[PDB]
């Protein structure tokens, strides 16, 4: 299993500052949202966004006080191994890119992936998130 | 396997403001309703609706033309090793100016033993909400 | 499979306002009555009834229906809504419905439906398919 | 399974029948309430116009009361344990309090059948002498 | 498949009013005595006895009932395990309210096979045990 | 198993018999009361007309009873496991009320087949054990 | 299947009054000592002792003892096992005039009360009425 | 099986009064020491000792005018774990001269029984063998 | 698994590097502290002379030129007998003079059933941090 | 297992030996007291007439006029886990000269029995072998 | 499997006083850090360092120590299940007491065979890891 | 199998008094340290050391009051059966011999041993400790 569906979106520039804010965790894996935040932040940087920062702890005023052009947020819908020995890793994530200038979602995407029996969950999550956020590469 | 049944509905415009409000969770999977909200909002956006927001009427203050609501009736793997993912959802589209349901749909799907629940859910919701694409 | 038994009933029209009221849950599956309410509301709408509304969370849902100027109330109960026990235990659904004339409280139509899926089927698929069958006489004519 | 009935009156469409508290002698929660709702729809399917379920019968001005008990309503234990239903019904004349009709029915499904299917089919068979004139 | 053993008894008529009073439950199946009570009542009625009432100690005297039907359930369960068979054991006494004497009594036991229903076995057994109380 | 009985008096149809507290030495609840109800109906089916179950020795003297049947259940269970066989063990004593002496006594045990019911085995065994007490 | 080992003993007449007293229960089986009492009491009467009572006076002998084993061994088809000791005591001087120990392992398809009833009957047979 | 080791000892006579005091229970089988007491007392009588009594320290024997005291301990008294786990018994006995408190005789015995034998049978058989030197001369 | 690194500065042997609070997003206790001590020894082995781990702005007091931080996303054996070790880590290198991330990397690895979790983590962390050699 | 013994003094029939507090380092309750009862009977069976078990702090022995004190510890006394888990026993002993407190003899013994042997039989046999140098000469 | 990685370091002399201080336990095996301390201390002695002391529970300044050996245990367990193999992971640092700098560090991991002992694997690994500190 | 590694050390005489002092237990087997102390003390005596005693309940003061020439101390790092039916006994010990006249460690050793599925834990520990302490035989 596995689909990535994304909208159109803006061309990000290297100098666009992006804050990663509170990716919700809708799974029973503790800290899956925080894992998705750390992976997503490094993905955005690896794609050429110079200045990416994860929020600590509306949230618009936090991003503006950070001089951020965009806020990347989203939700983890699935982040687990299926039950049983050799149960496969499954990942499901949604992202939204929020234009801090006007508050509107200017880009979003949903991605899911089902790994093989042999796969690691973090490998599957890291590959999927990189693919999902690929339209947000810079330059 | 599963079916989708949809009523007639209006032709949605790209500029139609849509608020996704409170998708109830009738399952024992925590947060399944919230997952359905996030997936549904992204689906409407990917279908061509520019302005979609999830509520935290409130919609009438946000100047929304339509509200999308609904309920998750099933959202789990069936029991046992290799128990297959199963999903059931209902959606309704409300005209904010008069509160009438102008479109509604029910969808269910059963995946294969190798399928991920979120993949089944995301595919089904896309199919179910497909008459709400921007024409 | 299972069985469906439906009495006779009036021909519904597109403009007949129907309120769906408190479907009782006699199973140990939480919220099964609320799931049946949602599926039933959409089915009635799929059937050509334009204005169909679910009462919010006893006889105060009846008062709500009267305040909505509903012509009929759809109520009922869920007798079964589970997978049978075990790996590959099959889904099973049992439901009863009544259509009540709001102006005088008379039951003008009622029906009972049950169904058993195979090991591979989904509970919600079975429930949705069955309620569609059971409520088919309430389609707009 | 099996069904055994007494003789009874020929009910008319207009006989107001209150379906009252069906006792649950099983460990399946609400099995009596399920039997009540199925029995009520059975009587209506059989042609009895005004059928009501108790939340008393005299305040509804019912002519007959349908009561009874559920003696069994479960799946037997284990994977593919078959459903089994046992029910007794009585029709009571409200004015004089006498039992004017009674029946007992039991049924054992096969392993792949639904409990609610077996109960619905059985209750219809048991209440068939109460179909309208 | 066990036994029924019945004593001699009086011939009952359709108009003999009969009260079924508390059937004791000596099993670990909740309400088995009440189930026996309900089945026994319908059995007597189906047997031709017109007026048969179940009690909620004199009482039957304040009911004009000619006979009291009482008893106890000794066994009412599925034996343990998958395909464990249903087993039932009952004793009944028929009491004359005009003097308190036991005028008829019977014991019955039955073991179904693995694929049978406990309620089917209880119902069939109780019909056979009370058969000498049919209206002649 | 076995059944062993002493000599005893010839019982008449007209002897008033009081069945009293049958002790339960098993971990099956109410086994003593079950044995009381089975034994009472057994004495009747054997021809004893007036036999009544007590709800001390004074109660039988209060009842104009000529004998008192008493005893104890030493075993009354299915052996453990699927197809565990029913096993029953009982002792009985018949007491003459006019002087308190034990005029008769019997012990009975039985192991039924794995496909038999405990109630059947106990009923058949009590009937055989009490058969010297027929009219 | 087990052993019975007894001392010499006196010849009991049908009129010797014998009181069966507290049979100690050294097993995990509730009431096994009481079960042994009722069985032993009936055994003595079945052997010809016309007057036997169990404690809850003026007897010539007293039967006492203890149950060392009274159970099924563990697992399905675990066999019944019984172990008992008995002492016969002349109340006139308190001396044990006869004693016996008995044990038995029944087969997997036998019941505990049968093994125990049969064993107790064999152990107490020296107390049969010889008149 | 196991082993029985006995010391030399005095020839007991029929009229020697022996009191069996308190066999210590060093096992997790409750009352195993009391079971050992009952078995040991019957064993002594079956071997020819006419007057044997079990107590309810050594002064109680003197207050019973007993010539000897049988004491001991149970080291093992169980079925080994699992279905068909075999019965195993281990006991130690000592015979004490009541006059001077000296141990005049002692013995240790152990036995592992067949999977299909009873613990009581193994224990009764072992105690009979262990105590056989105390048979009446 | 995978390893992906950004561009980064050329660390010299004399750059003081502080390793600070690697978050633990697993249910393995102390996995973050294990990553901190493995990462510190990896930086030294790569030719960086002075590496120190923070206890439980302090980097300013140490006059550190860079701060290495990160997060552990996975650090466990998969369930069952012979369940294989899985590791996932992210790192960021922070210029202390202005708080900017000047280098980041993400690494994941799935070992064989015969593999030890610490061997996988140590091997992965060495690979992930190799651009930080002298 | 193995048995290792030092040289020791030549014990006599009339030497008074007190068996004192054998430590229990196992999770088997009372394994130390069982070892004390077996050891005491082993010493008597070996020809030592006067052996007593006690109920620093050695002064109980100096009051009983004992020449030697036998002490020690149980390091292992159990069945290994599982159905047919074999009995395993490990003991250490020391013999103490009461007049000067010097350990004058010591020994260590271990034994793993067969799956079908009883723990008490293994311990009794092992302890009899370990203490056999203390038999009367 | 398993690797040992060591930096360069100073030649230790037989007379260099080394204090082993608090090896952190990052495992769920109680006392694994203390076990590593005892094994490390004996390893350094076996390598020819005369004076090696484990700190009680920069106190080494008072013990006249030239070097402090510290570190952490990242793994010290049998993998789960019957015949689960022993796995060990350790890091070490050698610290100059006079200025507090790390002058040597190393990381070792090892996975034993299913038949080997955890203490055997830890002992062999620690000896190889610390072998640069032989005198 | 396992390994034994010992440093050089002094030659002990039969008349050298040795005190065995608090062997730490770093296992989950209760009293394993006390068991190692008893085994070690008997091992030293079997090797020809006349006077050996185990400390009760700077503990150097106690040893000096016992006139001990050396103190044997150490730690138990492993003392258990591996998990499962037929799980083999495993033992790991460290020892140090302390010169009471100056507090210096003058001898130390590490031993580990993995037994067979059929062997007893106390047999394995006794054999290993005898091997480990064998340089301490009276020579």
Short mmCIF file of N, CA, C and O in Angstrom, two decimals, chain K residues 14 30-31 34-35 38-39 42 45-46 50 52 78 81-84 113-120 123-124, chain L residues 2-3 7 25-26 28 75 77-78 80 82-84 88 90-92 94-96 105 108-110 112-114:
data_model
loop_
_atom_site.label_atom_id
_atom_site.label_comp_id
_atom_site.label_asym_id
_atom_site.label_seq_id
_atom_site.Cartn_x
_atom_site.Cartn_y
_atom_site.Cartn_z
N UNK K 14 53.05 2.01 34.06
CA UNK K 14 52.64 1.11 35.14
C UNK K 14 52.28 1.88 36.40
O UNK K 14 51.32 1.52 37.10
N UNK K 30 19.62 -4.19 35.97
CA UNK K 30 20.14 -3.54 37.19
C UNK K 30 21.63 -3.82 37.35
O UNK K 30 22.10 -4.91 37.03
N UNK K 31 22.37 -2.79 37.79
CA UNK K 31 23.76 -2.91 38.20
C UNK K 31 24.73 -3.16 37.04
O UNK K 31 25.93 -3.37 37.28
N UNK K 34 27.72 -0.97 37.32
CA UNK K 34 28.67 -1.40 38.33
C UNK K 34 29.46 -2.61 37.87
O UNK K 34 30.66 -2.71 38.11
N UNK K 35 28.78 -3.56 37.20
CA UNK K 35 29.48 -4.70 36.62
C UNK K 35 30.55 -4.23 35.65
O UNK K 35 31.67 -4.75 35.66
N UNK K 38 33.64 -2.92 37.68
CA UNK K 38 34.51 -3.96 38.23
C UNK K 38 35.33 -4.64 37.14
O UNK K 38 36.51 -4.94 37.34
N UNK K 39 34.70 -4.93 36.00
CA UNK K 39 35.41 -5.60 34.91
C UNK K 39 36.45 -4.66 34.32
O UNK K 39 37.59 -5.07 34.04
N UNK K 42 39.51 -4.38 36.73
CA UNK K 42 40.40 -5.54 36.64
C UNK K 42 41.08 -5.61 35.28
O UNK K 42 42.23 -6.05 35.19
N UNK K 45 44.08 -3.31 35.44
CA UNK K 45 45.14 -3.95 36.23
C UNK K 45 45.81 -5.06 35.43
O UNK K 45 47.05 -5.16 35.40
N UNK K 46 45.01 -5.91 34.77
CA UNK K 46 45.59 -6.98 33.97
C UNK K 46 46.46 -6.44 32.84
O UNK K 46 47.40 -7.11 32.42
N UNK K 50 49.29 -0.51 37.91
CA UNK K 50 49.43 -1.00 39.28
C UNK K 50 48.28 -0.53 40.17
O UNK K 50 47.68 -1.34 40.89
N UNK K 52 44.74 1.01 40.54
CA UNK K 52 43.44 1.27 39.95
C UNK K 52 42.39 1.16 41.05
O UNK K 52 42.38 0.18 41.80
N UNK K 78 20.50 -10.31 27.41
CA UNK K 78 20.21 -11.34 26.41
C UNK K 78 19.04 -10.84 25.58
O UNK K 78 18.06 -10.31 26.11
N UNK K 81 13.71 -14.29 24.44
CA UNK K 81 13.36 -15.63 24.02
C UNK K 81 14.41 -16.65 24.41
O UNK K 81 15.54 -16.32 24.79
N UNK K 82 14.00 -17.92 24.36
CA UNK K 82 14.90 -19.04 24.58
C UNK K 82 16.04 -18.96 23.59
O UNK K 82 15.83 -18.74 22.39
N UNK K 83 17.27 -19.10 24.08
CA UNK K 83 18.47 -18.98 23.25
C UNK K 83 18.68 -17.58 22.68
O UNK K 83 19.48 -17.42 21.76
N UNK K 84 17.97 -16.56 23.18
CA UNK K 84 18.33 -15.19 22.86
C UNK K 84 19.78 -14.91 23.21
O UNK K 84 20.24 -15.25 24.31
N UNK K 113 27.13 -15.54 20.46
CA UNK K 113 26.29 -16.59 19.91
C UNK K 113 25.22 -16.97 20.93
O UNK K 113 25.27 -16.58 22.10
N UNK K 114 24.22 -17.73 20.49
CA UNK K 114 23.12 -18.04 21.40
C UNK K 114 23.58 -18.89 22.57
O UNK K 114 22.94 -18.88 23.62
N UNK K 115 24.70 -19.59 22.43
CA UNK K 115 25.21 -20.41 23.52
C UNK K 115 26.12 -19.66 24.47
O UNK K 115 26.49 -20.22 25.51
N UNK K 116 26.50 -18.42 24.18
CA UNK K 116 27.50 -17.79 25.02
C UNK K 116 26.85 -17.05 26.20
O UNK K 116 25.64 -16.80 26.22
N UNK K 117 27.67 -16.73 27.19
CA UNK K 117 27.23 -16.00 28.37
C UNK K 117 27.42 -14.50 28.24
O UNK K 117 28.40 -14.04 27.65
N UNK K 118 26.46 -13.75 28.77
CA UNK K 118 26.55 -12.29 28.78
C UNK K 118 27.81 -11.81 29.49
O UNK K 118 28.53 -10.95 28.97
N UNK K 119 28.11 -12.35 30.68
CA UNK K 119 29.33 -11.88 31.34
C UNK K 119 30.57 -12.22 30.51
O UNK K 119 31.53 -11.45 30.51
N UNK K 120 30.57 -13.36 29.79
CA UNK K 120 31.72 -13.68 28.94
C UNK K 120 31.87 -12.68 27.81
O UNK K 120 33.00 -12.27 27.49
N UNK K 123 33.04 -9.31 29.24
CA UNK K 123 34.42 -9.33 29.70
C UNK K 123 35.39 -9.27 28.52
O UNK K 123 36.35 -8.49 28.55
N UNK K 124 35.15 -10.08 27.47
CA UNK K 124 36.01 -10.07 26.29
C UNK K 124 35.98 -8.72 25.58
O UNK K 124 37.02 -8.24 25.10
N UNK L 2 34.00 -19.60 28.15
CA UNK L 2 34.38 -18.55 29.07
C UNK L 2 35.88 -18.43 29.16
O UNK L 2 36.64 -19.13 28.48
N UNK L 3 36.33 -17.52 30.02
CA UNK L 3 37.75 -17.22 30.14
C UNK L 3 38.11 -16.95 31.60
O UNK L 3 37.26 -16.60 32.42
N UNK L 7 46.10 -11.46 37.20
CA UNK L 7 47.35 -10.73 37.25
C UNK L 7 48.40 -11.55 37.99
O UNK L 7 48.11 -12.56 38.63
N UNK L 25 26.87 -8.27 45.00
CA UNK L 25 25.97 -9.03 44.13
C UNK L 25 25.36 -8.07 43.11
O UNK L 25 24.46 -7.28 43.43
N UNK L 26 25.84 -8.13 41.87
CA UNK L 26 25.25 -7.31 40.81
C UNK L 26 24.28 -8.10 39.93
O UNK L 26 24.08 -7.76 38.76
N UNK L 28 20.36 -10.47 39.74
CA UNK L 28 19.03 -10.58 40.31
C UNK L 28 18.82 -11.90 41.05
O UNK L 28 17.68 -12.22 41.43
N UNK L 75 33.17 -9.14 43.12
CA UNK L 75 31.81 -8.86 42.71
C UNK L 75 31.33 -10.02 41.85
O UNK L 75 32.11 -10.65 41.12
N UNK L 77 29.11 -10.63 38.75
CA UNK L 77 28.43 -9.98 37.63
C UNK L 77 27.37 -10.85 36.98
O UNK L 77 26.46 -10.32 36.33
N UNK L 78 27.43 -12.17 37.14
CA UNK L 78 26.40 -13.02 36.55
C UNK L 78 26.32 -14.30 37.36
O UNK L 78 27.34 -14.86 37.76
N UNK L 80 23.21 -17.18 37.26
CA UNK L 80 21.82 -17.51 36.93
C UNK L 80 21.81 -18.65 35.94
O UNK L 80 22.85 -18.99 35.35
N UNK L 82 20.26 -19.31 32.25
CA UNK L 82 19.64 -18.59 31.15
C UNK L 82 18.18 -19.02 31.01
O UNK L 82 17.75 -20.05 31.55
N UNK L 83 17.41 -18.20 30.32
CA UNK L 83 15.98 -18.38 30.38
C UNK L 83 15.53 -19.62 29.60
O UNK L 83 16.14 -20.02 28.60
N UNK L 84 14.48 -20.23 30.09
CA UNK L 84 13.84 -21.33 29.39
C UNK L 84 14.21 -22.67 30.00
O UNK L 84 15.16 -22.82 30.76
N UNK L 88 21.03 -22.77 30.30
CA UNK L 88 22.28 -23.20 30.89
C UNK L 88 22.73 -22.26 32.02
O UNK L 88 22.42 -21.07 32.02
N UNK L 90 25.17 -19.80 33.93
CA UNK L 90 26.21 -18.86 33.57
C UNK L 90 26.70 -18.15 34.83
O UNK L 90 25.90 -17.75 35.68
N UNK L 91 28.02 -18.01 34.95
CA UNK L 91 28.63 -17.35 36.10
C UNK L 91 29.69 -16.37 35.62
O UNK L 91 30.46 -16.67 34.69
N UNK L 92 29.72 -15.20 36.24
CA UNK L 92 30.78 -14.22 36.03
C UNK L 92 31.20 -13.61 37.35
O UNK L 92 30.34 -13.10 38.09
N UNK L 94 34.52 -11.32 39.52
CA UNK L 94 35.76 -10.56 39.59
C UNK L 94 36.25 -10.63 41.02
O UNK L 94 35.46 -10.60 41.97
N UNK L 95 37.57 -10.70 41.20
CA UNK L 95 38.13 -10.75 42.54
C UNK L 95 39.29 -9.79 42.63
O UNK L 95 39.95 -9.50 41.62
N UNK L 96 39.55 -9.32 43.84
CA UNK L 96 40.78 -8.59 44.13
C UNK L 96 41.28 -9.00 45.50
O UNK L 96 40.49 -9.23 46.43
N UNK L 105 45.83 -3.21 46.17
CA UNK L 105 45.47 -4.42 45.44
C UNK L 105 46.75 -5.02 44.87
O UNK L 105 47.46 -4.38 44.09
N UNK L 108 44.50 -9.55 41.22
CA UNK L 108 43.10 -9.51 40.83
C UNK L 108 42.91 -10.48 39.67
O UNK L 108 43.88 -10.95 39.06
N UNK L 109 41.65 -10.79 39.39
CA UNK L 109 41.31 -11.79 38.38
C UNK L 109 39.85 -11.64 38.00
O UNK L 109 39.03 -11.18 38.81
N UNK L 110 39.56 -12.03 36.76
CA UNK L 110 38.20 -12.09 36.23
C UNK L 110 37.98 -13.49 35.67
O UNK L 110 38.85 -14.04 34.97
N UNK L 112 34.78 -16.06 33.89
CA UNK L 112 33.42 -16.28 33.42
C UNK L 112 33.32 -17.72 32.94
O UNK L 112 34.31 -18.31 32.50
N UNK L 113 32.11 -18.29 33.02
CA UNK L 113 31.91 -19.66 32.57
C UNK L 113 30.45 -19.84 32.20
O UNK L 113 29.57 -19.38 32.92
N UNK L 114 30.23 -20.50 31.07
CA UNK L 114 28.91 -20.93 30.61
C UNK L 114 28.86 -22.46 30.68
O UNK L 114 29.65 -23.13 30.01
#
